[model samples]
Target: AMVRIFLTGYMGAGKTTLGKAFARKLNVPFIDLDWYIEERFHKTVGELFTERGEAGFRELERNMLHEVAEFENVVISTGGGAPCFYDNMEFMNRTGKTVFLNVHPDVLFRRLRIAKQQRPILQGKEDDELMDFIIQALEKRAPFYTQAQYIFNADELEDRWQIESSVQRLQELLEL
Candidate 1:
């Protein structure tokens, strides 16, 4: 059977970025679940949130996870809160390999600087405020993130070497 790897973590945890590298290393197709959800629903997440609110957004997320989990030879970069809401974590665990890309809060805060405005959820917040938000959110979401089958300490990854290390390690671990 083809293996599935779900990339789970906080918003700025490099789930999308690292997922690309990881998928390339494993020679698998990469799927950003957020984009998939948006495409499948024919609406942007920002629009979805405004149209349906958090509960409606989550219902869509949960339903997407149930469908996406069955896909194989893929690395799925999940939405930030996808694991905590609904049965996403459980479904991912049951379906295939899940990896939580554990980035340092400081690093996350720094990287999230350039694209802050585009992020509807974190937009309009100061850097300090954003850091606080991320920390608090992570504190509450850690339980779900930790459910991943693998944990990659991506805190110190500032360059290609580190990304390579993580991808290599993950590939070796999964034997993909």
Candidate 2:
């Protein structure tokens, strides 16, 4: 009951989508770091961001990251940029199994078009700029994400079967 698994990647990279099912399969608790922080403090992340600012929220998030890492046999789906800051990548790798959900920019863009995220919807109907932003952001975050021991091509997490298949492959990848 001491296994620790960290899922790191960009927003909409299916971290929670896969993490929930994977944690269920493993018979362990699933903790979304942001949600935990929110529930614990009784504040929405937006409220925390506005009151404390991004830097403050990150400081708090970092503290919570380490705090949650101490839990037994837990699977953590970290924030989108969690790995890129404050020796977090180092700590996570040292403490547990880290898997990067490798998703293509095009696939991410397509998924966002479905408005699964709380991002701004199309007004002028121009998606090129948004896609460009994703490319650049991915380029910047690539190094941090790639530091993970495992890089999973997580492009097929849509239907029930695909999700189950990914759960199986995730176990195989980790050899657990």
Candidate 3:
């Protein structure tokens, strides 16, 4: 069977890291939605945000999401905000098995703090302020994320081995 796996999560929750490895293990294609959007639009996500604003960017995001949903035997890693807009959460649930990566806010803060510079939305947050930001986003996004068919605990993907193990666990979780 051609299985479609959609990985949904808050930022820094290891969706891309786990999605890539999980796709490899399943011998399927992997699409990180943000990267796909950038490649298709010929602009950085930051540039898109600057030029089009949130509403415009979200429209583009939803279109790209529907486009990718047609692929067979694929894994899709969505941006944190992707499911919160339009009918995206429902669409993903209809198209395939949506897996939510559930990680605690504190864990997300630790993961994102080091890599915050690369993320445009998270750039200006001070060390002390990052946790609150993550918490608030998580609280707001939780309803959308909880609509997923599967919820995987993703707090331990802090190292290479942990990621690999998580992929293995995820495989079992999905019964692949």
Estimate every model's Cα lDDT from 0 to 1: 0.84, 0.89, 0.91
Candidate 3 Cα errors over 4 Å, as ranges: none
What local lDDT does model 1 show for residue 77? 88
- Candidate 2 matches the true fold with a TM-score of 0.93
Better of 2 and 3 by lDDT: 3
lDDT of 2 by residue, 103-146 (tens): 98888988777764476433333488778877888899998999
Candidate 3 TM-score, true structure as reference: 0.94
Which prediction has the highest lDDT against the true structure? 3
lDDT of 1: 0.84
- Candidate 2 runs further than 4 Å off: 121-125
Q: Residues 1-176, candidate 3: write the lDDT tens digits.
A: 78999999998899988998889989898999999999999999889988999999999999999999999999999999998999999999999989999998878888888887867688888766877788888889999999999999999987899988999999998888
- TM per prediction: 0.90, 0.93, 0.94
Worst 10 residues of 3 by lDDT: 118-127
Our model 2 lands, by Cα RMSD against the true structure, at 1.8
State residue 70's C-alpha deviation in candidate 2, in Å.
Answer: 0.3
